[PDB]
Design a protein around this ligand. Structure first.
Ligand code: NA
Length: 312
């Protein structure tokens, strides 16, 4: 009947003679009460993916922003965005009321991440995380933490860990949440008692909670386009200047900045030249989802484009 298999101490597969995998199993057993043989059975099926390793290693004016923008802001995407917003309008409104994060932002994030559930990833999360945890020294500690959390997530949401698919880095569902984001920020927004990253309502609430947790200020401006050029100052989402310094550099805001006394200097390559912007706190909050000026601007503008297409 019950097969303890205490003597089955050597698992097979791609991670068979991997010390990192052995240490990881020990940690799960010691810290979380996992069973060594059960975990060995799961990991013996995990695959070491060369592609996952290659991709993690891989990471004017010439119209740079224009090229990035058109990857996301197209008639098909805007139209699908309108369909998603209308379909989940109650959840979006509820997220706005509870977290202070507007529908255009949530719709923009989910659109850029997975085209509203159409492209959620084809790689088994277990394979990606095991590969990065056991055969990638550079970020092994980070990924081992993600694998630990993933296995705990599967246990708690009662998922077979081998059945879940996602990105080459282990990101999941509509919002491409990493396991650590599920742990710290995902919420049961549907009200069914579970937190399902593949449930659009749970994903909407989870993205909203992630935003509020990272400082989203309800009703505050994201960024304000500037008139003028500031070629002498370094730019990017990580920069920080007083409004006074930006003025001395030749900039004026197109919309009043209210009480904001500092801003990042964003510069978008529009082909014919450069378009400068005053980046406000909420813009930086968007970059907390993906550290990129282009990403945050695409998320924001896609959401704006969808909001406008809904009005028509
Ligand atoms: Na739920």
């Amino acid at each position: 009947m019950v097969e303890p298999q205490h003597n089955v101490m050597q698992m097979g597969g791609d991670f068979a003679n991997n010390p990192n995998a052995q240490q990881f199993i020990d940690k799960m057993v010691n810290k979380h009460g996992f069973d060594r043989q059960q975990l060995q059975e799961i990991l013996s099926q995990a695959k070491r993916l060369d592609s996952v390793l290659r991709l993690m290693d891989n990471q004017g004016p010439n119209g740079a922003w224009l090229r990035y923008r058109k990857k996301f802001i197209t008639p098909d995407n805007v139209q699908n965005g309108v369909v998603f917003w209308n379909q989940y309008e109650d959840a979006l409104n509820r997220a706005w009321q509870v977290y202070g994060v507007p529908p255009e932002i949530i719709v923009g994030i989910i659109g850029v991440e997975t085209r509203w559930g159409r492209v959620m990833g084809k790689t088994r999360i277990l394979d990606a995380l095991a590969t990065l945890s056991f055969n990638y020294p550079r970020r092994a500690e980070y990924f081992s933490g993600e694998l630990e959390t993933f296995l705990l997530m599967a246990r708690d949401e009662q998922d077979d860990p081998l059945n879940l698919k996602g990105s080459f880095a282990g990101a999941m569902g509509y919002g491409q949440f990493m396991p650590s984001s599920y742990k710290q920020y995902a919420v049961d927004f549907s009200g069914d008692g579970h937190i399902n990253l593949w449930d659009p309502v749970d994903a909407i609430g989870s993205v909203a909670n992630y935003f509020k947790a990272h400082g989203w200020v309800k009703g505050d401006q994201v960024a304000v386009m500037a008139n003028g050029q500031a070629p002498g100052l370094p730019n990017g989402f990580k920069t920080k200047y007083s409004i006074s310094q930006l003025a001395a550099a030749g900039l004026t805001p197109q919309q009043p900045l209210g009480n904001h006394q500092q801003a990042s200097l964003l510069r978008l390559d529009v082909g014919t030249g450069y378009q400068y912007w005053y980046g406000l706190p909420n813009f930086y909050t968007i970059t907390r989802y993906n550290h990129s000026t282009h990403y945050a601007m695409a998320v924001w503008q896609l959401g704006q484009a969808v909001a406008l297409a809904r009005v028509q």
